[PDB]
Amino acid sequence: VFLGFLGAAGSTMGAASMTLTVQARNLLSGIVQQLKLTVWGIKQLQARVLAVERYLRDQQLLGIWGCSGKLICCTNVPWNSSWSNRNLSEIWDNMTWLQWDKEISNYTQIIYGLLEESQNQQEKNEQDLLALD
Amino acid sequence: VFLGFLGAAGSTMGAASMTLTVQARNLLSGIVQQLKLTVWGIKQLQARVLAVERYLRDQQLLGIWGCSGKLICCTNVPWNSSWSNRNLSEIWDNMTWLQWDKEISNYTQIIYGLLEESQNQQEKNEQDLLALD
Amino acid sequence: VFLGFLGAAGSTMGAASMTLTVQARNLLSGIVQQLKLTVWGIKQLQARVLAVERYLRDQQLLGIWGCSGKLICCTNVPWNSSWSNRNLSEIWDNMTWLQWDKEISNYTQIIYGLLEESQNQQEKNEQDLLALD
Amino acid sequence: NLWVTVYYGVPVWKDAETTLFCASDAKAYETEKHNVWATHACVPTDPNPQEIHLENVTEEFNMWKNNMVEQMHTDIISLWDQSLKPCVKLTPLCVTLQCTNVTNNITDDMRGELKNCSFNMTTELRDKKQKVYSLFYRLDVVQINNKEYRLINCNTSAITQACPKVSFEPIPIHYCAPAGFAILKCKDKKFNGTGPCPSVSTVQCTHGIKPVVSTQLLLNGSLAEEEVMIRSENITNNAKNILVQFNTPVQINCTRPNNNTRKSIRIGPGQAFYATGDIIGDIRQAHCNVSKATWNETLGKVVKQLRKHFGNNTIIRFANSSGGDLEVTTHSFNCGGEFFYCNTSGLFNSTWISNNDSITLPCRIKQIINMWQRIGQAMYAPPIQGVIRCVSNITGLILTRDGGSTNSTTETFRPGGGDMRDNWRSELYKYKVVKIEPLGVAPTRCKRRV
Numbered sequence: 001v002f003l004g005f006l007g008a009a010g011s012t013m014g015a016a017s018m019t020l021t022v023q024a025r026n027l028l029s030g031i032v033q034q035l036k037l038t039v040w041g042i043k044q045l046q047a048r049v050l051a052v053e054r055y056l057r058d059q060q061l062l063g064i065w066g067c068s069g070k071l072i073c074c075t076n077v078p079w080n081s082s083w084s085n086r087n088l089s090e091i092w093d094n095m096t097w098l099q100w101d102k103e104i105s106n107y108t109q110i111i112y113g114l115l116e117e118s119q120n121q122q123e124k125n126e127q128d129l130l131a132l133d
Numbered sequence: 134v135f136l137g138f139l140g141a142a143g144s145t146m147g148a149a150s151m152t153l154t155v156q157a158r159n160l161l162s163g164i165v166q167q168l169k170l171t172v173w174g175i176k177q178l179q180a181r182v183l184a185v186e187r188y189l190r191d192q193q194l195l196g197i198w199g200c201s202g203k204l205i206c207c208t209n210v211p212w213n214s215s216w217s218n219r220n221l222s223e224i225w226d227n228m229t230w231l232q233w234d235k236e237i238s239n240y241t242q243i244i245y246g247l248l249e250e251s252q253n254q255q256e257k258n259e260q261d262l263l264a265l266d
Numbered sequence: 267v268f269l270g271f272l273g274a275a276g277s278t279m280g281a282a283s284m285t286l287t288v289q290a291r292n293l294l295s296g297i298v299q300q301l302k303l304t305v306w307g308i309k310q311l312q313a314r315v316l317a318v319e320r321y322l323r324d325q326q327l328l329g330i331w332g333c334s335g336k337l338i339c340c341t342n343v344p345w346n347s348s349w350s351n352r353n354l355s356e357i358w359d360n361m362t363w364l365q366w367d368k369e370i371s372n373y374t375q376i377i378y379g380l381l382e383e384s385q386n387q388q389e390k391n392e393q394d395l396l397a398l399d
Numbered sequence: 400n401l402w403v404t405v406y407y408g409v410p411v412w413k414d415a416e417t418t419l420f421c422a423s424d425a426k427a428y429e430t431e432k433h434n435v436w437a438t439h440a441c442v443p444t445d446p447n448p449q450e451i452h453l454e455n456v457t458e459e460f461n462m463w464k465n466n467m468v469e470q471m472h473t474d475i476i477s478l479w480d481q482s483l484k485p486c487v488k489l490t491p492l493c494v495t496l497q498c499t500n501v502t503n504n505i506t507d508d509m510r511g512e513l514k515n516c517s518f519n520m521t522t523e524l525r526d527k528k529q530k531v532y533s534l535f536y537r538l539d540v541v542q543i544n545n546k547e548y549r550l551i552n553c554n555t556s557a558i559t560q561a562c563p564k565v566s567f568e569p570i571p572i573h574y575c576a577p578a579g580f581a582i583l584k585c586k587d588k589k590f591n592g593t594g595p596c597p598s599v600s601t602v603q604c605t606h607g608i609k610p611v612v613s614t615q616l617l618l619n620g621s622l623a624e625e626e627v628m629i630r631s632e633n634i635t636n637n638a639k640n641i642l643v644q645f646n647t648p649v650q651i652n653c654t655r656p657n658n659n660t661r662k663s664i665r666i667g668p669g670q671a672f673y674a675t676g677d678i679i680g681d682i683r684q685a686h687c688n689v690s691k692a693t694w695n696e697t698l699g700k701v702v703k704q705l706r707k708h709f710g711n712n713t714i715i716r717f718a719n720s721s722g723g724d725l726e727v728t729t730h731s732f733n734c735g736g737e738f739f740y741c742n743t744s745g746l747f748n749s750t751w752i753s754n755n756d757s758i759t760l761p762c763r764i765k766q767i768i769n770m771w772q773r774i775g776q777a778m779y780a781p782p783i784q785g786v787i788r789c790v791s792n793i794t795g796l797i798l799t800r801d802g803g804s805t806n807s808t809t810e811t812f813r814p815g816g817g818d819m820r821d822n823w824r825s826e827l828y829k830y831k832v833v834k835i836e837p838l839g840v841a842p843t844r845c846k847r848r849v
């Protein structure tokens with residue numbers, strides 16, 4: 001369904017689970033076009049550099065959690081329940097993304113580290129192992 | 134054959150179909166190196182930011198038409214003939230890229246939308262389906 | 267082993283062969299945050315643009331040597347021994363990356379060209395061949 | 400059949416505008432206000448100006464609708480600017496000058512051509528004043544109502560003496576295009592100026608372009624090949640200009656044969672003004688020599704080419720310009736640092752039917768130059784010490800028509816203009832910027848639909 005930019009903000013997470021691209025497109029705004037010092041000129045350029053910098057930070061994060069085939073990354077290792085344990089219906093029948101981030105805001109830096117370290121290192125050097133026969 | 138930058142401009146599209154990388158390399162010019170206001174300084178920086186901005190716009194487009202394994206993307210869905218229907222020989226034995234873009238210049242924004250929406254959404258959530266068994 | 271940024275500099279190449287990500291993370295420094303002309307302002311921005319420019323140059327190189335699944339690219343074609351022929355133990359039991367680059371510094375631009383041309387063109391148009399049946 | 404396919408790397412461009420940055424070589428040393436010209440902040444050129452001729456290409460150019468001339472013109476203005484921000488602001492000069500004649504040779508073969516002016520002036524101390532004196536070219540001093548005179552641009556503009564470190568020696572500038580763009584160069588020796596050029600090449604960036612400032616005469620420019628082309632969007636219109644471009648560098652020798660002395664006056668604190676102390680040596684008149692023979696022959700080549708646009712049944716007349724402001728009446732240019740205004744009557748003084756010695760051109764020397772017809776701004780060249788001897792080609796021409804009244808055989812052309820952007824279009828006519836779109840959609844037997 002064509003919601004639009006943030007169009008699924010007022011929807012359960014599984015609802016927004018289909019409209020991901022619409023936000024991604026707005027990460028350059030195309031034509032933007034945005035002359036001496038020119039107040040609003042420095043602003044224009046500082047804006048664009050901020051935008052690409054922002055974009056590249058997270059694209060880097062995804063490079064690290066090596067998927068690049070984004071919107072979905074899935075492996076076969078279980079998940080830790082300690083971090084605000086909740087039910088399936090408590091998420092998909094009871095929560096939208098907004099309310100969800102309020103609760104998950106604590107464990108982010110934790111999760112970043114192990115998704116970074118564990119799979120990258122394990123999937124590493126096994127390709128090195130199978131590069132023999 | 135080592136044509137060079139745009140070296141296959143005067144060639145049928147299938148001819149240029151082998152020299153794609155040569156243009157891609159020129160998308161940073163390396164050493165470029167291009168101090169107060171310094172007319173040509175603002176020019177230098179505004180140039181570089183324009184370059185990476187340009188690069189990232191299209192790299193984004195390719196991110197959306199999710200391939201990233203560029204120069205070729207192919208699926209198994211048919212193609213619409215309505216848009217300036219022509220023959221195979223009318224393209225490879227009768228046309229170079231230059232003449233081709235003149236004719237295709239109308240349907241671009243159309244094509245962008247469905248290549249963006251259709252395959253992304255269909256290939257989406259099926260990975261979600263096969264993440265069960 | 268958690269060495270850290272460049273932490274495996276004083277180690278054989280196979281040792282550093284596990285700590286690759288740690289340098290990659292430092293390619294944006296996150297919070298950096300780095301107002302009129304403001305000496306150190308122009309410096310800040312010129313720095314950030316230099317950083318992303320640097321990043322994108324090599325990411326481009328990797329785009330060309332089309333892997334994007336980085337840290338390892340491997341095919342089945344032999345390798346030329348002419349370029350400073352050495353032994354396996356002469357590398358993994360006798361050399362760290364530092365000492366290695368001193369010796370390989372000559373053949374870089376050579377290697378870049380064939381890794382760019384050969385596999386890209388061969389793996390090209392064969393996908394075009396198998397797009398028939 | 401035919402189905403949809405995406406490519407990346409498709410050598411296709413569009414006509415576009417973008418910004419182009421300079422590219423130079425490392426020779427940045429001179430002695431009048433900063434640097435060489437501006438060009439020392441420039442990125443050094445690649446030692447291999449790589450080009451590539453593009454087979455089979457046919458692209459229409461429009462040397463009259465190109466944009467690069469516009470960027471270039473603004474940037475040259477601004478660089479002149481930046482060179483003139485940091486050096487002394489000569490406002491307290493605009494003072495009542497006590498001037499008399501400089502008794503040049505009896506009776507008169509310099510007619511003075513310069514007055515001797517003393518004046519009050521501030522000092523190092525914002526206190527008891529000083530009385531100095533200096534020699535000014537009577538072309539930049541104006542009366543009121545000895546007699547009291549003043550600087551010309553004063554009641555209209557401020558003045559800004561260039562200090563002694565930049566040059567005005569034009570240095571080859573290489574307009575270079577930022578990544579993702581391309582520069583197209585028309586390789587066709589025979590090109591009108593517009594329309595489809597069949598033989599073309601791509602370069603990463605252009606040749607050295609001597610950014611000489613000149614009027615009525617393209618100096619040091621490039622030369623045409625095998626012919627002397629004529630360029631103008633609408634020759635049949637009398638309101639454009641004709642851009643002639645020679646095959647043969649017709650020499651011209653210009654000189655100022657004085658040993659002139661630099662007298663420094665401290666407009667304190669710290670600011671110092673360079674006046675014309677005195678003149679020693681052979682007091683000839685500043686001038687320029689040209690081989691009459693080559694000029695006549697080559698202008699006959701021009702007769703042929705002008706005929707080819709007007710019929711072998713015509714008579715063409717070259718007259719001098721019909722008067723007006725100085726900056727258009729004369730061949731004005733810069734040379735060894737100085738600014739020359741050469742009267743060119745001695746070069747367009749002939750009607751021409753259907754079918755050593757050398758020419759001397761008497762030129763005057765100006766100081767308070769108003770560059771680019773801009774008002775409110777005024778540079779003040781300093782008296783360049785020594786003798787000036789300066790040699791150059793003349794490669795092209797800039798003409799203006801007045802005919803189409805009883806328009807049968809006798810057409811009269813006179814030189815003029817005053818917009819440098821003509822000068823600039825004369826060397827960028829072969830050049831065009833294109834934006835690259837390495838994204839491509841095309842049909843092959845790869846398949847997707849709606």
Ligand SMILES: *[C@@H]1O[C@H](CO)[C@@H](O[C@@H]2O[C@H](CO)[C@@H](O[C@@H]3O[C@H](CO[C@H]4O[C@H](CO)[C@@H](O)[C@H](O[C@H]5O[C@H](CO)[C@@H](O)[C@H](O)[C@@H]5O)[C@@H]4O)[C@@H](O)[C@H](O[C@H]4O[C@H](CO)[C@@H](O)[C@H](O)[C@@H]4O[C@H]4O[C@H](CO)[C@@H](O)[C@H](O)[C@@H]4O)[C@@H]3O)[C@H](O)[C@H]2NC(C)=O)[C@H](O)[C@H]1NC(C)=O
Nearest residue numbers: 428429430566568618619732733734735784788789790791
């Ligand atoms: C169209 O293009 C043509 C070229 O294609 C241009 O022709 C150029 O015209 C200029 C104007 O004259 C020439 O530059 C100046 O030439 C002066 C004459 O000196 C020359 O002759 C003497 C005697 O034969 C030689 O000794 C000189 O050689 C020595 O000096 C030069 C320059 O210093 C060195 O490079 C040599 O290695 C020798 O050491 C010359 O051959 C010359 O005085 C002048 O030099 C001053 O100006 C430059 C830049 O303006 C300064 O960087 C330099 O330091 C000098 O300025 C300082 O020194 C003097 C010394 O008295 C002081 O008085 C000054 O105040 C300052 O402190 C410069 O070389 C040029 O040579 C010539 N092109 C060629 C290829 O020869 C046309 O100009 C152009 N069209 C137009 C309309 O301009």
Ligand SMILES: *[C@@H]1O[C@H](CO)[C@@H](O[C@@H]2O[C@H](CO)[C@@H](O[C@@H]3O[C@H](CO[C@H]4O[C@H](CO)[C@@H](O)[C@H](O)[C@@H]4O)[C@@H](O)[C@H](O[C@H]4O[C@H](CO)[C@@H](O)[C@H](O)[C@@H]4O)[C@@H]3O)[C@H](O)[C@H]2NC(C)=O)[C@H](O)[C@H]1NC(C)=O
Nearest residue numbers: 649650651652653687688689690691755757758789790791
């Ligand atoms: C601007 O000013 C410059 C310098 O004043 C002029 O450049 C000079 O141009 C003249 C015209 O060609 C040159 O004169 C000729 O040079 C030829 C080659 O030079 C050799 O011979 C001379 C002796 O003449 C030697 O000193 C020199 O080292 C070379 O070995 C000579 O062959 C010519 O001589 C022939 O013609 C004359 C007729 O004039 C005969 O009398 C001779 O017998 C012989 O048949 C002649 O000398 C001169 O060389 C150039 N200068 C320099 C330094 O070389 C520009 O022409 C001038 N431009 C304008 C528009 O005025």
Ligand SMILES: *[C@@H]1O[C@H](CO)[C@@H](O[C@@H]2O[C@H](CO)[C@@H](O[C@@H]3O[C@H](CO)[C@@H](O)[C@H](O)[C@@H]3O)[C@H](O)[C@H]2NC(C)=O)[C@H](O)[C@H]1NC(C)=O
Nearest residue numbers: 495496497498517518519520526527528529530531545547
């Ligand atoms: C600045 O330079 C000017 C000339 O360039 C000097 O002008 C002179 O000024 C003096 C006054 O200081 C004038 O003297 C006056 O003469 C009249 C009649 O003789 C007398 O009635 C007055 O009382 C006064 O004495 C003099 O005429 C005048 N000369 C000219 C040619 O204008 C001026 O003195 C200089 N100022 C400084 C500070 O150096």
Ligand SMILES: *[C@@H]1O[C@H](CO)[C@@H](O[C@@H]2O[C@H](CO)[C@@H](O[C@@H]3O[C@H](CO)[C@@H](O)[C@H](O)[C@@H]3O)[C@H](O)[C@H]2NC(C)=O)[C@H](O)[C@H]1NC(C)=O
Nearest residue numbers: 593631632633634635636637638639800801802803804806
């Ligand atoms: C280049 O400039 C010339 C003018 O020197 C243009 O020619 C002029 O064109 C206009 C209309 O395009 C003419 O107006 C009308 O023309 C008709 C037919 O000639 C006439 O019967 C009318 O009375 C009226 O004048 C004008 O006469 C004509 N002038 C000349 C001298 O030819 C020309 O069109 C310009 N180039 C281009 C490409 O437009």
Ligand SMILES: *[C@@H]1O[C@H](CO)[C@@H](O[C@@H]2O[C@H](CO)[C@@H](O[C@@H]3O[C@H](CO)[C@@H](O)[C@H](O)[C@@H]3O)[C@H](O)[C@H]2NC(C)=O)[C@H](O)[C@H]1NC(C)=O
Nearest residue numbers: 499500501514515516517530531532533534675676677678
């Ligand atoms: C411009 O005109 C002024 C006059 O208003 C000239 O200034 C004066 O020029 C004379 C000679 O031309 C100098 O004469 C000397 O005077 C001293 C003291 O009286 C005497 O002892 C010497 O033997 C000699 O006769 C006088 O100094 C000078 N005055 C000043 C203030 O400089 C000036 O020469 C003219 N400009 C030029 C370029 O000729």
Ligand SMILES: *[C@@H]1O[C@H](CO)[C@@H](O[C@@H]2O[C@H](CO)[C@@H](O[C@@H]3O[C@H](CO)[C@@H](O)[C@H](O)[C@@H]3O)[C@H](O)[C@H]2NC(C)=O)[C@H](O)[C@H]1NC(C)=O
Nearest residue numbers: 719722725728729740741742743744745746748761762763
């Ligand atoms: C540019 O140079 C030309 C010459 O190359 C100058 O034109 C000359 O101007 C004078 C004065 O107007 C003409 O003199 C005339 O002589 C006749 C006969 O004696 C007399 O009756 C007139 O009253 C006038 O005095 C002279 O003929 C003329 N030369 C030519 C070849 O036409 C011109 O003034 C110069 N202009 C500039 C801006 O440098």
Ligand SMILES: *[C@@H]1O[C@H](CO)[C@@H](O[C@@H]2O[C@H](CO)[C@@H](O[C@@H]3O[C@H](CO)[C@@H](O)[C@H](O)[C@@H]3O)[C@H](O)[C@H]2NC(C)=O)[C@H](O)[C@H]1NC(C)=O
Nearest residue numbers: 718719720721722723727728729741742743744745747748
């Ligand atoms: C271009 O060449 C022409 C022809 O030599 C010059 O035109 C002539 O200019 C002179 C003055 O320079 C004119 O003299 C006239 O004298 C009367 C009587 O004193 C005066 O009232 C006028 O105002 C005018 O000055 C002469 O009539 C005129 N003749 C022609 C046929 O145009 C012109 O000056 C030269 N210009 C340059 C830049 O070389």
Ligand SMILES: *[C@@H]1O[C@H](CO)[C@@H](O[C@@H]2O[C@H](CO)[C@@H](O)[C@H](O)[C@H]2NC(C)=O)[C@H](O)[C@H]1NC(C)=O
Nearest residue numbers: 078079080081082083084085106107110111114
């Ligand atoms: C699942 O998460 C819990 C906490 O959210 C982890 O408990 C940690 O256990 C280590 C090892 O004893 C302690 O050092 C930490 O202090 C514990 N965490 C906290 C917040 O106190 C638990 O280890 C995680 N599961 C696994 C398998 O490691």
Ligand SMILES: *[C@@H]1O[C@H](CO)[C@@H](O[C@@H]2O[C@H](CO)[C@@H](O)[C@H](O)[C@H]2NC(C)=O)[C@H](O)[C@H]1NC(C)=O
Nearest residue numbers: 211212213214215216217218240243247848849
């Ligand atoms: C192939 O393209 C044609 C036009 O290029 C499409 O025709 C459109 O059909 C829809 C549905 O009736 C109309 O709303 C549009 O107005 C039509 N297009 C135009 C330009 O009028 C056709 O639908 C496409 N093929 C498929 C299968 O959708």
Ligand SMILES: *[C@@H]1O[C@H](CO)[C@@H](O[C@@H]2O[C@H](CO)[C@@H](O)[C@H](O)[C@H]2NC(C)=O)[C@H](O)[C@H]1NC(C)=O
Nearest residue numbers: 344345346347348349350351372373376377380
């Ligand atoms: C392996 O490398 C060597 C040199 O490092 C290559 O030798 C080149 O051979 C070509 C063809 O005769 C010559 O034009 C070059 O001059 C040689 N190189 C040098 C440095 O002289 C050799 O060709 C490479 N292996 C293969 C299979 O090509």
Ligand SMILES: *[C@@H]1O[C@H](CO)[C@@H](O[C@@H]2O[C@H](CO)[C@@H](O)[C@H](O)[C@H]2NC(C)=O)[C@H](O)[C@H]1NC(C)=O
Nearest residue numbers: 498499500501502503506507510511512514537
């Ligand atoms: C100073 O220079 C001027 C420049 O022309 C000379 O002009 C004199 O002007 C008056 C006008 O009132 C005429 O009556 C004179 O005939 C002109 N003189 C000449 C020689 O033509 C003026 O003569 C010069 N003064 C001195 C003292 O040389």
Ligand SMILES: *[C@@H]1O[C@H](CO)[C@@H](O[C@@H]2O[C@H](CO)[C@@H](O)[C@H](O)[C@H]2NC(C)=O)[C@H](O)[C@H]1NC(C)=O
Nearest residue numbers: 590591592593594595629630631632633634708
């Ligand atoms: C531009 O070049 C063309 C030829 O290259 C000149 O003449 C053209 O002639 C064709 C007929 O073969 C006409 O269809 C074109 O319209 C002409 N060109 C123009 C611009 O009208 C032409 O004279 C040249 N342009 C100029 C101003 O001289």
Ligand SMILES: *[C@@H]1O[C@H](CO)[C@@H](O[C@@H]2O[C@H](CO)[C@@H](O)[C@H](O)[C@H]2NC(C)=O)[C@H](O)[C@H]1NC(C)=O
Nearest residue numbers: 703704705706707708709710711712713753754
């Ligand atoms: C130039 O003069 C000739 C004869 O005096 C005229 O005749 C042309 O001559 C050229 C030779 O260069 C031929 O190529 C043409 O085919 C001839 N055409 C005609 C109609 O005779 C020619 O017309 C004159 N050119 C102009 C522009 O007036």
Ligand SMILES: *[C@@H]1O[C@H](CO)[C@@H](O[C@@H]2O[C@H](CO)[C@@H](O)[C@H](O)[C@H]2NC(C)=O)[C@H](O)[C@H]1NC(C)=O
Nearest residue numbers: 718719743744745746747748749750758759760
């Ligand atoms: C310019 O052309 C004219 C005409 O061909 C030459 O003739 C001069 O014409 C004027 C007109 O009044 C006379 O006063 C002169 O006396 C004529 N010259 C001579 C030598 O008598 C004139 O010589 C040419 N001058 C230039 C500089 O080209």
Ligand SMILES: *[C@@H]1O[C@H](CO)[C@@H](O[C@@H]2O[C@H](CO)[C@@H](O)[C@H](O)[C@H]2NC(C)=O)[C@H](O)[C@H]1NC(C)=O
Nearest residue numbers: 619620622647648649650651789790791792793
């Ligand atoms: C006018 O342009 C010509 C272009 O030919 C310049 O000629 C050069 O002269 C030098 C020495 O005579 C040669 O080494 C160059 O090869 C010549 N250029 C070319 C393209 O062959 C000439 O220098 C220019 N005029 C002046 C006064 O410098």
Ligand SMILES: *[C@@H]1O[C@H](CO)[C@@H](O)[C@H](O)[C@H]1NC(C)=O
Nearest residue numbers: 083084102103104105106107
């Ligand atoms: C997150 O941490 C804050 C910090 O005090 C705490 O108040 C909040 O309850 C925590 N929420 C969850 C879901 O852990």
